Every structure is written in structure tokens, then in C-alpha cells.
DNA sequence: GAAGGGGGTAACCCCTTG
DNA sequence: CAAGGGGTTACCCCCTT
């Protein structure tokens, strides 16, 4: 869209299913993969400097989930990283694409958060006056920290890629616009699991409903879940599972009774969809097929 | 059951399903119940002084699981307790039975264990030499502590009732033999809750086996557990569920295929039992009935 | 409200496998 | 080791009478 040189995320990170590691857990536990990684094909976050060919330097750091992108308490740890959480690669005059195949997220302790925060905030405001730092600003620097620690989500981070075109000097000194990735959720964090149907005991029934199904899923909250049956033919037929939270077994299974199909006296089987749906959210699981059958 | 007065545990504590509380959790989280408590009928650990009627003092403290009963790092907390973990009641000249209806177990931190240990050990060896404790004696007492902390199970405790018959003095100075209860497992610990079958999708099958059942459980260790089918000591015939640990869905469910019954073409249907059984241990869930059907 | 239960959350500690 | 994963502790809350 912009005429000038710019960075583009070729492959965003995994928005779900990456674990943030604490300082104690040990240094390599896996690298942040790409949004299209599977067991066979692994992919990693990738970016490219479009609208220029030449030597250049791309760096990533963790920013808040909040759109005004501020530095996160969390740091990137990796084979290619600063001890501030800043990861740096060099793109060759031919290859303008940077893959970041070994990126970890160091999870800060809540009792660590302030000091880690003032430390990244100092580092940030050192270019304005590198010789020395005044109390007059150290007081107000600590003021950001406190206000940020109150609202900062330790479960969600965003990669921020900052590209720098090496100048005539030999100095990698020219900035490009910084490009912020989609959010990255901690896999080991409260709720915010993607609703998954592992398997079900029945995939067929009668048009009459009332057929009892055992559904195995990933963690669900007994009071926030439902089982939506539907046909997305724009008729927009929908009905629901019949159960009580007691029927939701230790947040990993649902025993429900199928609803009746809208139209009985059907002559042939009809395939519909069912899906888990959080009422409190909008969030849905992958839909599975269910086939209604005719009568007597 | 010899000549003299002795104590007897009328109602032992619940060997499973009691939670030990840390110092931080609070007081008043519930009392150690008797082995026969239900939500309607509550019962608490009870003991009686046999072969004597008169004023007497019974005290309870936590001892190791190890047969040589040594004092546990854990302390009893409650309305009737010392700050050392010693709980004391008085039995009247009429009623020689003592109920302990509010007993909590204060869980020591592993970094607390040493100091709590030397402190209970001093208290133990303070009537042996109350004047002072000699430096020479100090280091031998500290040794016990270290070699006891290495093998002491913080998940299992035993109540030790020490009864004392009050003399003519007014001094509760006569000892009875101390009676040690059966072990008490921390509910919140590795394998110390009860294997439970919540519900199953099928309670009947064919003699041929291979019928797929969804079983909902309380918890499982995925590669620990099995599904034992068996007869009522007809011969003790037994067979097993067919499933991989992949089939055990997240510690709360098992999808298995029923085994074939030993004798096919049974003229009419046969009811057998199935049960969860830890492969490692002996431990079994409550058995559920399953009915085999003949062929056609 | 406190008692009397129970479940979730942070931080860490591990164990499988290559 | 790397790359996942699950389980453990100490603590923090939260429902119900």
C-alpha cells in the first residue's frame, strides 16, 4: 500500500498452543512456531523486507496485546537474542526474508515484573539523553511501570518486528515502519482454550431427538458451554443439547441428549452439524457431522 | 485385650480423602472424619479406655507411617490442640469414649521441615534434661532430623492416641499403652484419591467382545490404569479392556473395546463385573455390572 | 459472617524421546 | 543436549450453610 520499503509478516506465529517458560524451567524447551506448523511440516515466524534489496537488520521484541504497542514484561530468549529480549537477524543482499526458528518467551514472575519493567523502560529511554538519568524522570519512569503492571496481560504477547536498512556509513541506522503480529496466547494460562471435540459415542440418531451422546472434549466450564446443532443453509435452523452442568464430567466430557430435528416425517437421512459453543463468548469448536434418521 | 486398662480405636480416621492444609490456607477448613462418615451421617476418629472407669486424659499426635512410630513433621491443629501438634481430651467417669470431631493436619513446607523437626525433637528431649541442652547432644539430635527428613513421607500420617489415667494426686500421670491408627493419605497427593467410575456409555454387549465403551472416571494416570472384567469367584475368570493410552482422554475418560467372554454361546445372558484397576498397585474402583449377550 | 468443603492459579520441577 | 510434555508444591480463592 505504502510506496516506500516496508516489512511484511510472511508467516505469523501460532496464536494458540505455545507455552511461555519461566526462568527456572531451563533454556531450550521449543521455539515459537509458525501458524501453519504440523508435526511433519514445521514452520516458524517469517518476515520479509519488501520494496528494497540489500543488507538489512530485522529485530523482534515482545509488545503488549493493547494496540498502543508498549514493551512487554516478558522477554524473548533464543540463539539470536539480546539479554533485553531483542532478537536480531541480518538479511543478505539477495535473501530479504528472515525466519526466526528458535524463539522462546521467558515468563516473568509477578515479583520480578517491576524491576524487569524499569530495566526495559530505561533501555528504551536512553537515546533521549544517554549520558545520565534524572530523578525527575526516574520517578515518572517508575510511574509507567506501576500503571502498566496493573492492566498488563501476562497470557498474551505480540511480536514486533523492527527492520533497519544499513546506510552508506556501514551503520544499520535507517528505520522502516514496525510491523506487529497477531496475539500469542500462553498455552499454560487460565481458560482461553480452543474448544475441541476429541470424539463422541454416537454420530447418528433419530429425527425424534433424545438420543444420549457422550462427547469427549478439551477443558470446558460447566456453566459456560452448550452444544449447538445447526444447518448453515441460511434457513438457519439451530437447536441445543439437553443436559445439566452435572452432566458435564470433570470439564472434559459432556453427556447430553440430542435435540429433535425441525422437520419429522423425513424420508431420507439428513446430515446436520453439531458444535460446542461458549454462550458467554462467541467461541465455537470445530463442528462434527451428525445424521438424523426417519421414524419407525 | 490383656489384663490391664488399654485404649481402643472405636472409629479409625478416613484412610483416603482428607486434605492436609498448609499454614497459609487457613484454619477451619474441615475436620478429619471417621472411616464411616457420609454427608448425612458424620463420624470422627473415636477411641475408648477399656477395663477402667474414671477421670482420664487422651491425647493425639501425628506419627510416621514407618512402623517405629516417630513424631511427624506435620502438626495437628484445632480447638483442643497444643501449638506443638498435641490434642488433648478429658473422658468423664461415666463416658470413657473420646471423639475428636475437629482435627486438622497442618502441612509443613519442605523448607520448613528441618526447623519444625529440630523444634519437636527438642521438645521431645526436654524432660530427659530440662536444665539445658548440651552442644554435644545438639549435633546428634540434628543428625536424626536430617536422616528422617530424607525418608519421611509427607503424604501419609498416623494418629497416635496416648491415654493417661489421672492418679489420686489430681495428676494425669499414669500411662496406658499408645494405640496407633491406620495410615491417613493426603487427598491432594499423587495416587491417594478413590478410583471412581462416574458413568459408562454401554452396560451390555455381545459375548464376542470388541464393543466400544466410553467410560467416565475421577482421575487416571494414562499408562497406569486398566479395565478388569471378572466373575464372582466362579473361577475368578478375568479379561481386560482394549485401548491405548491415546484412548484415555485427559485423566477423566477411557474409550475401550470390551473383551470377549470366556465361554461363547451361553444360552441366556450373563452379568459380569468390570472395574478400574491400577496396573502398578492393587487399587480398584467400585465395580459396575456388565451383561454379556449370546450370538445370532 | 464464620465454618466447611472444593477448585484454580503461579512457579517450579520433572519425565519422556530423540 | 534439544523438543515437548505432564505432574508437584504452596498458595490463593470460590462456593455453600
Numbering used by the authors:
A (entry chain B), B (entry chain A): 34 to 329
What does the published report state?
The DD alone mediates protein homo- and heterodimerization; the NTD and DD together are responsible for DNA binding; and the NLS region is flexible in solution and together with the DD forms the binding sites for the inhibitor of NF-κB (IκB) proteins. The mammalian NF-κB p52:p52 homodimer together with its cofactor Bcl3 activates transcription of κB sites with a central G/C base pair (bp), while it is inactive toward κB sites with a central A/T bp.
We mutated the central and flanking bps to generate PSel (mutant A/T-centric) (5′-GGGGTAACCCC-3′) and (−1/+1 swap) (5′-GGGGAGTCCCC-3′) DNAs. PSel (mutant A/T-centric) showed twofold reduced reporter activity, while both PSel (−1/+1 swap) and MHC-κB showed drastically reduced transcriptional activity as compared to the natural PSel-κB. However, compared to previously known structures of NF-κB-DNA complexes, two striking differences are observed. Throughout our simulations PSel (natural G/C-centric) largely maintained its widened minor groove at the central 0 position, while the minor groove in PSel (mutant A/T-centric) narrowed slightly; PSel (−1/+1 swap) displayed a significantly narrowed minor groove, which became similar to that of MHC-κB DNA recorded in the simulations. Both RMSD and minor groove width show less structural stability at the central part of PSel (mutant A/T-centric), which may be attributed to the occasionally formed cross-strand H-bonds. Notably, we found that the NTD of p52:p52 subunits could make contacts across the central minor grooves when bound to mutant A/T-centric and −1/+1 swap DNAs. Specifically, the clamping conformation enables Lys144 to form cross-strand binding that engages the phosphates at −3/+3 positions in the opposite DNA strands in the mutant A/T and −1/+1 swap DNAs.
